[PDB]
Amino acid sequence: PAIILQFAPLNSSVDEGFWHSFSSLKLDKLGIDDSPISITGFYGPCGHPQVSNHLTLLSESLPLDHGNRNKCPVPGILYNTNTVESFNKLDKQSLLKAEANKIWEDIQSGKALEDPSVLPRFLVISFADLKKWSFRYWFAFPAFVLDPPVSLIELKPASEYFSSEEAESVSAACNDWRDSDLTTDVPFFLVSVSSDSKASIRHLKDLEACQGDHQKLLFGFYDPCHLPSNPGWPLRNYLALIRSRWNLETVWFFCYRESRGFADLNLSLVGQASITLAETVPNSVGWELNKGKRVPRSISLANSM
Amino acid sequence: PHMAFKEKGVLSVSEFVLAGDNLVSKCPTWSWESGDASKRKPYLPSDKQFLITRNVPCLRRAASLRTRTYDLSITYDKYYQTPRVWLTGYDESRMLLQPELVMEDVSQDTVTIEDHPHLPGKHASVHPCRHGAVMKKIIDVLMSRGVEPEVDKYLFLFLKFMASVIPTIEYDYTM
C-alpha cells in the first residue's frame, strides 16, 4: 500500500573547538557586530547500523582569516547575538525562509545541479556568553514541504532490491567514488546499473547521459540516517531538485550508508517515491528538536577553556 | 627500526605515519588531521599530526544500557615512542559528556584527564607508559606462532589491545 513518506530529522554536532575558535573571532576581530557570518558544516553517510551521522561544526567551519572522506562540506550561516534577550527576539521564520530561499534559488539557477552539496544548506542561531563561558544555540536544516506530500511505494534494504552481482558491482563503484579525492565529498549522485548487471556512478549533471539502455537509474545520496524504515533528511531538498528540474512522477532513490568505512548494502536502502507534479518557494520546516521539543541547546565550557 | 619494534615495542615518527596511513587505508573510518596550527609538531607532516574517528557508538557501559557516542584520537607521544588514545564522550542527544563520566566506559579490569596536544579542552586518556611493554608481549606471542608482524601494522595490534581497555566503544580495526 502506497503510504506517506516520512524523513528522519537531521541532528547536529558542535565540536568543542568551534566555540573556542569563535570566542576568539568575536573578541579579537568582530566586536559588537551581530552581523551574520557564513560558515561550513560537515556531514557524511551513516557509518554504523546503530547510530546515524550528524551535521558537524568544527573549528575548520569558520572562515580562514577543506573536505575529506569523513567531512563533506555544506554551506551555512551563523547568527550570534550579544544578549539573551536579543537571542530570544530572533525571527525564526523569516530567517528560516531566508536560508530556504537561497536553496530554492540554487535549485532554480542550475547551481544545485553543478554543486548539489548546496542542498543541505543550514542555519545556526546562537548566543555566546563570553562572561560565563556558556553557549546557547539552535540549528536549522531547511527542507521544502511539497504541496502534495511525497508518497512512498516501497523501501527495501539495498541488498534485497539488488541481486548478488548487482550488489558487488554497486559497492565496488560506491567505494571507488568514496576513494578518489575529487568525488569523495560529493554527497549526491546517480547510480546506473546496466542490464548486464554492471554498476557505475555519475554526476547529477550527467543525467541525460544516463538514459540509454534497459538500465535502471537511481538517485543516490549520502544518507546520514541509520533507521531501516526511513530515509534521511537530505532526501527532501534532493527530491525537490529532481522535481524542479526533470519533473519525474516516479523516482527511485538510493539511501547510501556504510559500515567499517566501506559501502554496506544491508544497511543502505533502495526506495521508490511518488510525486504528483508558475510556482514559487514552498514551505520549509526543520528546527532541530531537543530531547524531543522545540527548544534550543546549551553547553557550558567554563571548565575547559 | 624493526629491532626496536620487536625488543622495545616502540615506534619511530616515520613508522607512525606509515602505520597511520595503513590504518586509514584499511579502516577509512579513521582520518588524518592537522589540528591547531599553533600546536603543530614540526617532526610530523602538517596534514598528518594525529588520527581521529568520529561518531563512534557505545551502547552500554563497561560494567556490562543507554547509548553514548565517542570521538577518539590517536596522537604520537614523542617521549615513549608509542601512540596515545584520547577519547571524547557524548550524550544520547549528542551533547558533550563530562570527562570523568568516560571512566564508566573504561574497563575496571590507568586512565587520566589531561589537555590534548593538538586540540582544546580536557580529554580522558589511557596513559602510554605501559604500551611499550604491552606491545613487546604481543610481538613475542605472535613471533613464535609464526606470524612476524612489521611496523606498518602497529596500530592494528595497538587497537586490538585497547579493546580490552574500552570494550564497549565500537571503533574499527582489522586483523
UniProtKB/Swiss-Prot annotation, chain A:
Enumerate the transmembrane spans.
none
Q: Which gene name belongs to this protein?
A: ATG7
Organism for this UniProt entry? Arabidopsis thaliana (Mouse-ear cress)
Q: What is known of its domains?
A: The C-terminal residues are required for homodimerization, as well as the interactions with ATG3, ATG8 and ATG12.
Q: Please identify the protein, giving its name as recorded.
A: Ubiquitin-like modifier-activating enzyme atg7
Reported tissue expression? Constitutively expressed (at protein level).
Knockout: what is the outcome?
Increased number of peroxisomes and accumulation of peroxisomal proteins.
The record's comment on protein family reads:
Belongs to the ATG7 family.
Full-length numbering of the shown residues? 7 to 325 of 697
Q: How does it assemble?
A: Homodimer. Also interacts with ATG3.
Role this protein plays: E1-like activating enzyme involved in the 2 ubiquitin-like systems required for cytoplasm to vacuole transport (Cvt) and autophagy. Activates ATG12 for its conjugation with ATG5 and ATG8 for its conjugation with phosphatidylethanolamine. Both systems are needed for the ATG8 association to Cvt vesicles and autophagosomes. Involved in the senescence process. Involved in the degradation of damaged peroxisomes. Involved in the non-selective degradation of chlorophylls and photosynthetic proteins during stress-induced leaf yellowing.
Superkingdom is Eukaryota
Swiss-Prot record, chain B:
> Is Ribosomal protein there in the keyword field?
no
**GO cellular component terms listed in the entry, alphabetical order:** cytoplasm
Q: Which key words are in the record?
A: Autophagy, Cytoplasm, Protein transport, Transport, Ubl conjugation pathway
GO terms in the biological process aspect are: autophagy; protein transport
User: Which InterPro entries does the entry mention?
Assistant: Atg3/Atg10
Q: Does the keyword Cytoplasm apply?
A: yes
Task: State the active site.
Answer: C129 (glycyl thioester intermediate)
> What single Pfam family name could you report for this chain, choosing any that match?
Autophagy_act_C
Per the record, the domain of life is Eukaryota
The terms under GO molecular function for this entry are: ubiquitin-like protein transferase activity
Output the Gene3D superfamilies linked to this UniProt entry.
Answer: 3.30.1460.50
Where is it predominantly found?
A: cytoplasm
Function of the protein = E2 conjugating enzyme responsible for the E2-like covalent binding of phosphatidylethanolamine to the C-terminal Gly of ATG8. This step is required for the membrane association of ATG8. The formation of the ATG8-phosphatidylethanolamine conjugate is essential for autophagy and for the cytoplasm to vacuole transport (Cvt).
By sequence similarity, the record places it as follows: Belongs to the ATG3 family.
Self-association and partners: Interacts with ATG8 through an intermediate thioester bond between Cys-129 and the C-terminal Gly of ATG8. Also interacts with the C-terminal region of the E1-like ATG7 enzyme.
This protein is called Autophagy-related protein 3
- Show the taxonomic lineage: Eukaryota, Viridiplantae, Streptophyta, Embryophyta, Tracheophyta
